[PDB]
């Protein structure tokens, strides 16, 4: 099976990528999230995520692609309001999202 996993990218001075359950229930609007779908890697950043989280999200996505997929996977960047169909096919319709936490 193609992998399905979700990483919460959160922090500021120290930013960490933590694996969380694949669900909208794991999302908030203050962090970035990487939905790894194997051949496609979705890099989603909340409207209130900060620059350190966004930069860490880009590093994590390229890391998965180059170092775990032999460079052979697409990274797709989306924001709130531009989520692609395949993301919604996996997670279901987008609900309201809570604010992030410090």
């Amino acid at each position: 099976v193609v992998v399905q996993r979700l990483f919460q990218v959160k922090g500021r001075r120290v930013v960490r990528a933590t694996e969380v359950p694949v669900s909208w229930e794991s999302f908030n609007n203050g962090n970035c999230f990487i939905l790894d779908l194997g051949n496609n890697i979705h890099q989603w950043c909340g409207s209130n995520s900060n620059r350190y989280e966004r930069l860490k999200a880009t590093q994590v996505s390229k890391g998965i692609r180059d170092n775990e997929r032999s460079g052979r996977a697409r990274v797709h960047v989306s924001e709130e309001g531009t989520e692609p169909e395949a993301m919604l096919q996996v997670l279901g319709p987008k609900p309201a999202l809570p604010a992030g936490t410090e």
């Epitope: 797709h76 960047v77 169909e85 395949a86 096919q89």
Partner: nanobody
């Protein structure tokens, strides 16, 4: 989620055809769509693509100046108007969807398209 094409058939050289593809089923949003063609005995090759909103289009070399891709976002349909056909345009024509791409028109690479219709046959006589 579900793609079904229509409008192919047999046409004289120089003639026109209008293919259409219906998007049905569970759709949550708009998505990239494109048209490919498989000549008798060959592989699938890019013809044209169009972005989620229909605002941007992209065309293969052979399609420039002859074909027009469009979409009706209300009906969830995309069309390929093919004008001034010639015999080597004979192929099965497939509408495909790139559900992962968040913006822009489709790429020209078959492997970027994950959802496919069943295809409509197009024969150009001589």
């Amino acid at each position: 989620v579900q793609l079904q094409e229509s409008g192919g058939g047999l046409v004289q050289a120089g003639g026109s055809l209008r293919l259409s593809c219906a998007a049905s089923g569970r759709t949550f949003s708009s998505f990239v769509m494109g048209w490919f063609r498989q000549a008798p005995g060959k592989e699938r090759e890019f013809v044209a693509s169009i972005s989620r909103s229909g605002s941007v289009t992209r065309y293969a070399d052979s399609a420039k100046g002859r074909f027009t891709i469009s979409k009706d976002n209300a009906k969830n349909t995309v069309s390929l108007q093919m004008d001034n056909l010639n015999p080597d345009d004979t192929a099965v024509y497939y509408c495909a969807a790139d559900l992962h791409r968040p913006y822009g028109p489709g790429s020209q690479r078959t492997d970027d398209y994950d959802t496919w219709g069943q295809g409509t046959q197009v024969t150009v006589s001589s």
